[PDB]
Structures are given as C-alpha cells and as structure tokens.
Amino acid sequence: MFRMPIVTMERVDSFSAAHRLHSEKLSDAENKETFGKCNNSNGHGHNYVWKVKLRGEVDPTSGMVYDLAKLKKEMSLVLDTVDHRNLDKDVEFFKTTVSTSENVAIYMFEKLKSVMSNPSVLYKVTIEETPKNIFTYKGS
Amino acid sequence: MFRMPIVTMERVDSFSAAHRLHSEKLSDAENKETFGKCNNSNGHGHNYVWKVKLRGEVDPTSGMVYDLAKLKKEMSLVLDTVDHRNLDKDVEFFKTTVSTSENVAIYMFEKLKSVMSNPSVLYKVTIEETPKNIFTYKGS
Amino acid sequence: MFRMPIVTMERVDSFSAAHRLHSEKLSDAENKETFGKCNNSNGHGHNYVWKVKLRGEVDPTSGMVYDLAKLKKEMSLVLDTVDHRNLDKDVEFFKTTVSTSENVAIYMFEKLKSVMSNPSVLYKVTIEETPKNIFTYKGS
Amino acid sequence: MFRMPIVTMERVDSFSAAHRLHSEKLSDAENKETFGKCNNSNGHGHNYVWKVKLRGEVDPTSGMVYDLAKLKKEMSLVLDTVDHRNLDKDVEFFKTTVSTSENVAIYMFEKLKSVMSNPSVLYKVTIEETPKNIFTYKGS
Amino acid sequence: MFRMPIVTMERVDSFSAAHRLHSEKLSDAENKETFGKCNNSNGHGHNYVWKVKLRGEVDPTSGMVYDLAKLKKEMSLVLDTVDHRNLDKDVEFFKTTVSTSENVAIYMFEKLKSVMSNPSVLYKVTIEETPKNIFTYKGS
Amino acid sequence: MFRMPIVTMERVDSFSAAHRLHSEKLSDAENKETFGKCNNSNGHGHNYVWKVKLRGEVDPTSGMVYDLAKLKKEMSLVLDTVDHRNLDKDVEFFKTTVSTSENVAIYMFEKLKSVMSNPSVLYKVTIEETPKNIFTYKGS
Ligand code: NA
Ligand code: NA
Ligand code: NA
Ligand code: NA
Ligand code: NA
Ligand code: NA
Ligand code: NA
Ligand code: NA
Ligand code: NA
Ligand code: NA
Ligand code: NA
Ligand code: NA
Ligand SMILES: [Zn+2]
Ligand SMILES: [Zn+2]
Ligand SMILES: [Zn+2]
Ligand SMILES: [Zn+2]
Ligand SMILES: [Zn+2]
Ligand SMILES: [Zn+2]
C-alpha cells in the first residue's frame, strides 16, 4: 500500500428557486421582525450557486479524486429537487425547516450524500444565495 | 456654445424576486408548452442584475454625464417596486404583461424614465436574469 | 399590425479546445514571427466563452425575442463541432482559415446561422479567448 | 481588392491610482456639494479596469484585426502614466481637467491614440471605476 | 440541550481608499527598495473587497448563524472609517502600522470585533486589494 | 522574540495550455471509458487559473507575509514551463503522470516549492481548470 497525495475537487453549478422565510414556530409579527423583507408573503427568489467540494487521494491510474461524470449525475439528482421550484411549497424538507441559506446548504449536503456512489469523499457544500452572501457546511 | 465629449455612464445594481411565466392569453397546456419549467405553478426566482446606462455630454464643471447621487436615488425608487417581491403578484404591471426578462427590461426602463430628474440621457437598460441570460432595451 | 418593442437576448456558454496559430501562407520563420508563442508546435488551448446575441420584436404572447429552449439546441449543435476538440486538426474549417479568435467568432456566427430555426434575429457573436481578450462579429 | 469581415478585438488591463474630485472652477463649498465624499481632502482610490476595443478588417494572412503584441506595448506606455500614481498630482492632464472617470476615459483614449502604430482602428475605451460604475468613450 | 449544525455565513462588501506604503522605521531609500512603486510619494489606491466570515450553530428558530441586518450595521460602522478615505492620513491606526493589505485585514478584523453584538462568531476576514492579491486573517 | 499575527497572502495568475487525458497504464478502450471526450486524440485545452497561497507571520517592518516582487518572479519561472504549451508533449513531468488537474495542482505546487526563496511559507495551490472545476493541494 502507498498513500497517494490528498487533493480537493470542487464542482460549481446553480439553480433558480423561489422562497419565503417564515417559521411555523414564530407569530406573524415575530416572523416579520426576524425575517423583514424576506418574509414578503408572496415570496422572492435567488439564483443559488451550489459548489460541491470533495477531498481524497488521487487515483494513480485515472489521476482523479472522483469521477466527474459520476458527480455530475449525482449533483443533477439533487438539483432536480430544487431547480425552478418553490423551496417552501415544492420541497418536502422545507415544510418543517426554514429555508434560510444555512438550511439550504445543509439540505443539499445531506441530499447529495444520500445519492453519492462514494459519499466518503464529500467534504464541503457552498451555497451562494447572492454574490454577496455565501454559506458553507461540512456535515456532522 | 461648445459641444462637449459624449461619454456613457453605467451603474449596476441588483434585486431578488420571484416569478412564474404564465400568459392569460394561453391555455394551461399552451403555457406549459411555451414556458416549460418556468411555468412551475408555485414559481421560481432570480437575482436580477440591473444595469442602467446613460449617454450625454460631459459637464465642463462637474466632469459628469449625470449626478451619480441623483441616479442612485432614482434607481432606488424603481428597485423598491421589485426587490424581495413576487413580480406577477406584487407588481401591478405584471398582472397583464408576462414577466419574461424581455418585459422586465422594458418595465424597468420605463419606470426609471418616469422618475428621472433628467430622463433625456437614459440610453439603455440591461437585465441579467442569470449570469448566462442577458437582455437589453433602448426604448422606443 | 403593431410593431412590438425591440429587445436583445443573449445566451452565454463555453467550450474547451486546443489550437495552434499557423498560416499555410507563411514560412516557418514568418509564422514564428507573426504568432510568437501562439505558434508553439504542439499547440496550446483555451476555455472559450461564446455569447450569442439576438435582437428582435418581443412576442406579445410568449414575451420572448426567441425560444431559449430552441436556441439551446441550436447552440449545442455548433458547440458539438468544437468542444473538447483541436480546432486546426478536428474542424474542417480551420484547415484553410487560421484559428485566431477573430476567425473563430466568424466560424461560430456562420455555423450557428446555418442551423437556426429563425436566423434573421441573429445579431452578434462574442468569443472570449481569455477573460482579457474579447472578440465580436456581426456578420456581413 | 476584397473587403474582409469586420471584427472587434478588445483587450482588458487595469491600473491602481489615487485621486480626489475637486474642480478649480468651484468654491470649497461647491466642491463638497458637487463631489461629496469624493472630495475628501486626502483623496481615495480605485483599481481602474481599462478595456481597449479595436474594430477593423480581419487580415487574411495573420487572421488578426491588430497585432496583440504591439497593442500590449502601446497600452503599457499609457498605463505607465497612471499606474500606482495620484491622477491629480502626478499626471499633468488632471491638473486642469477634473479626474472623474468620464474624463479618465477620455484621457486614456486620447493618450493611447497618440502612441498607436495604427490609431485608425481604435474604436472604444472603457473605464470601470469600480465593478458597479462603468464609463465608455468613442472619441470625436 | 442539543448542539445544532455548524455553518459559515460570509458577507461581501467593498471600500475605496488611497494609501502609500511607507514605514517610519525605514530610510527613504529602504522604503523605495522595500515597497517599490507602492512607495509613490503621492500615493495610489484600490477598491478593496472586504469579506466577513462568521461560523456558529444554526439557530433552530430563525435558521441563521447571525442576524444579517445586525451584521450589515456593524460592518457599516467599520467601513465608515475607511471608505473614500486615505488610510495613512485619515485613519489613526495607520499612522503607526504600515498600510499593507496584511495589516488592513488585521485592522478590519479587530475593528469589526470591537463593534459586534456577538463577536464570538467572527471567524475570518478577507481583503482583496485587487482581484489578483487576496489576504485573510483569523485573529489570535 | 514576539510572534507576529499570522496572515495569508494569495496571488492569482493564469496560463493557457493544451492537453489530452491518456494513461499509459490503460488500454485504448479503458482510456476512452475513463476519460471520455477528454481522451480526444488531438487534445483540447484550458485557460488554467493558478492561485498561490502563502501563510506566515507578518513582518513588523515591511508589513508583508512575503515579498510580492519575489513571488512574482518565482511564479513566472513555474509559469514559463506550462504557458502556451502542450502539457503532455512539452512538459517532461506529464510524460509519466496523467495531466488531470489534480496532478497539475501537484506539479505546480512542487515546481514552485523548488524555486522559492522561502518555500516554508507555501501553503496552498489552486488550479481552476474552468470556472466550474476547481482543485487544491497543500503538499505532503
Ligand atoms: Na419572501
Ligand atoms: Na448567487
Ligand atoms: Na415558475
Ligand atoms: Na443574474
Ligand atoms: Na500553439
Ligand atoms: Na475565456
Ligand atoms: Na477624495
Ligand atoms: Na473596477
Ligand atoms: Na504610493
Ligand atoms: Na479588489
Ligand atoms: Na483530449
Ligand atoms: Na479557468
Ligand atoms: Zn431569500
Ligand atoms: Zn425565471
Ligand atoms: Zn490561443
Ligand atoms: Zn473616485
Ligand atoms: Zn496599494
Ligand atoms: Zn481538460
């Protein structure tokens, strides 16, 4: 056995979605106060940038940390759940957990981990809600 | 009189909004066929980039095509109508004109022209629905 | 009849390709002198950004200058010819016209025009050879 | 004779400079009112993005609108005048014309035109004072 | 008690400032040699990008690592000290510590920490002096 | 002695290169299957973004983690080996190690470390093969 160099591989994609920040554990007034304009009753939306970062040994034969073709398919499966959708209304997960970008990052990390051929190399998910507001999550 | 150099001045801002592409002049099936995933019943959303381009003589005293402080205020007035809103439900204009980015560009151009201290220098509006889909409008 | 507002619609994609700048109408020395490091005998490469800009009346029913789904398919047909290829060796056109980005812009414009469902709205092609070197072409 | 396709070629570079917006034709109070925080007595600064756009026939032999190596040298000559400098204090031109980005665009266009091997193809200069504030100039 | 997922939240803003790199502990010649063109006597300037990264448990009710509205106000307080200013002349801190971007990152981190409602979640500051030169600091 | 604040300094540059992903330890069919379109026999290419990140104590006199002028020269030496070249054919290293971006990141890290005046501060190399595919390496 010979341990190979450890490298990271990150793949960037995006999805467009609507949402409204509204907690079922808060009153109407509290939701307005906590979430401000993000609580607009008819919602608003974002192009979310999703970056998926893997870390692992370089394979000596393929030269890859992970098969990009395989990652593309797995990421597509996750993106299908959220792209051109309303997070709070169309995605079961967000019925019971507020759709802040913190919680979106967690959702995407966990859903991806659930579909991956080799989930052990999943290292970090990034969600950019806008170019100015960036969230990351590395799991438990 | 002495005509001064003609220069353009462009200012970039953004707004987050939800929408759904659905024409009242189309059947449900036709809307699905025309608009595809963009017709998702609960909508989706974008961070829209708005660029406002002015063209005019440079003022010999101030060195400006237009007062940026004034433009910022006028652009804010327009952005207030759409930011963190649902275009089709919250903005009267989109009740009767489909919220394609073509029509958003027209809306923003016309609304801005309506609030400007000097609307004669308004030259072009750009809307980037995503980084990959860009629309421009120069008026009548 | 009622002429509708004229708007532009631009769609951005990319392709990765190898090339070498070498004219069959120049000597070896002249090619080295004209093209410098771009004449490296084993070639070099770029991620080329391709932007396709259309201009036309907004449709009153669909709200679109052109059907994006249709454009995506037509652009794919063109991109298939160049993506992950060697321009000078794999693309017949470049056997007899030097693969400068000027000539790539012309190639992509003409090939796209050749496959378009409605080529009359094609307005401009942009090729970014790198983020710093940008070329555009509007046809004859 | 055979007229060749007309293509544009644009090259992007940058320079870092300090400035203060202050007109000798305005009083202290007027300068404060016209220029606001831009009139800060000790100045402020920008990374200015400079884009130089040329337009002309493609050469049948070289495939180029202009020799990029030559443009790089000519642009360097202009950039030497402004990079890591204070516009108002170090550049003679700005002693008598206010250093607004409108006037910077004009300055760079004219200075470049003055050093170019083939100035007839110079088509447009862009200055981005910040990513949000963009100016262009096409000459007389 | 139940420990919640740990997520990062990063907010990006910018400021324009002039500076000159000049150490009071170096001779004129040494300053020229150490700092080169950055020692230009009348200074130069940058649009500095500032990114503020927080790390902490997601709140189960609000879904947030930190209140963005609160962060915006706190970051504004820091930005007021440097925006449209000359670092070395207008900001007391830089009279006695050289205004390299390393030291700017430290300054902004410490000043922000000093005004924060909950400074325990401050994790990292980034300063981009230009798009090509990036500095980060995580405190003591 | 007094330990100074630890800060990172990162410098971004780029190079254009051709390559083909093909392992000498795989059959023709296996190479096609492993590498797909990346195995195109005449190759393809990328503008690779290279970021070089250093980490170390801030110098109390210069205010720098490292001399940028020195880093620029050292990075140039590495870039000379790959810019406007074919990785697999022109660079000895890639004759025996597949030119995946994982292995490019390792190559650039090790080659830079080999030429650095102070290699102890080298912390991380990033290679962006395209804007969507990003690799990093921190050494052994
Ligand atoms: Na909302
Ligand atoms: Na975003
Ligand atoms: Na929809
Ligand atoms: Na956008
Ligand atoms: Na070559
Ligand atoms: Na490019
Ligand atoms: Na000032
Ligand atoms: Na800028
Ligand atoms: Na200076
Ligand atoms: Na910057
Ligand atoms: Na290949
Ligand atoms: Na890249
Ligand atoms: Zn939101
Ligand atoms: Zn949409
Ligand atoms: Zn090339
Ligand atoms: Zn300024
Ligand atoms: Zn500086
Ligand atoms: Zn490749």
Short mmCIF file of N, CA and C in Angstrom, two decimals, chain B residues 8 22 26-27 38 77 79 87 98 103 127 130 139:
data_model
loop_
_atom_site.label_atom_id
_atom_site.label_comp_id
_atom_site.label_asym_id
_atom_site.label_seq_id
_atom_site.Cartn_x
_atom_site.Cartn_y
_atom_site.Cartn_z
N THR B 8 -20.50 57.55 -22.02
CA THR B 8 -21.56 56.81 -21.35
C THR B 8 -21.20 56.56 -19.89
N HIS B 22 -46.47 32.80 -17.07
CA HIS B 22 -47.81 32.26 -17.34
C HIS B 22 -48.58 33.38 -18.04
N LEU B 26 -52.97 32.28 -23.01
CA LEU B 26 -52.68 30.90 -23.34
C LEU B 26 -53.46 29.95 -22.42
N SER B 27 -53.78 28.77 -22.94
CA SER B 27 -54.36 27.71 -22.11
C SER B 27 -53.33 27.15 -21.15
N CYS B 38 -40.38 26.96 -16.41
CA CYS B 38 -40.67 28.33 -15.98
C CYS B 38 -42.14 28.56 -15.61
N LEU B 77 -35.83 54.07 -6.19
CA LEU B 77 -37.29 54.18 -6.32
C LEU B 77 -37.86 53.07 -7.19
N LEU B 79 -36.20 50.15 -7.84
CA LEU B 79 -35.84 48.88 -7.22
C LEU B 79 -36.81 48.54 -6.07
N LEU B 87 -42.98 39.22 -8.77
CA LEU B 87 -43.28 40.14 -9.88
C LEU B 87 -44.75 40.07 -10.31
N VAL B 98 -46.61 39.47 -19.38
CA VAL B 98 -45.85 38.32 -18.88
C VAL B 98 -44.48 38.76 -18.34
N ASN B 103 -39.60 41.57 -20.90
CA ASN B 103 -40.61 42.51 -20.39
C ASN B 103 -40.21 43.19 -19.09
N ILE B 127 -30.95 43.74 -18.17
CA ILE B 127 -31.34 42.83 -17.10
C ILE B 127 -30.60 41.52 -17.33
N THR B 130 -29.93 35.52 -15.24
CA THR B 130 -28.83 34.79 -14.61
C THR B 130 -27.56 35.27 -15.31
N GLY B 139 -35.55 51.46 -25.48
CA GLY B 139 -36.75 52.30 -25.54
C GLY B 139 -37.31 52.34 -26.95
#
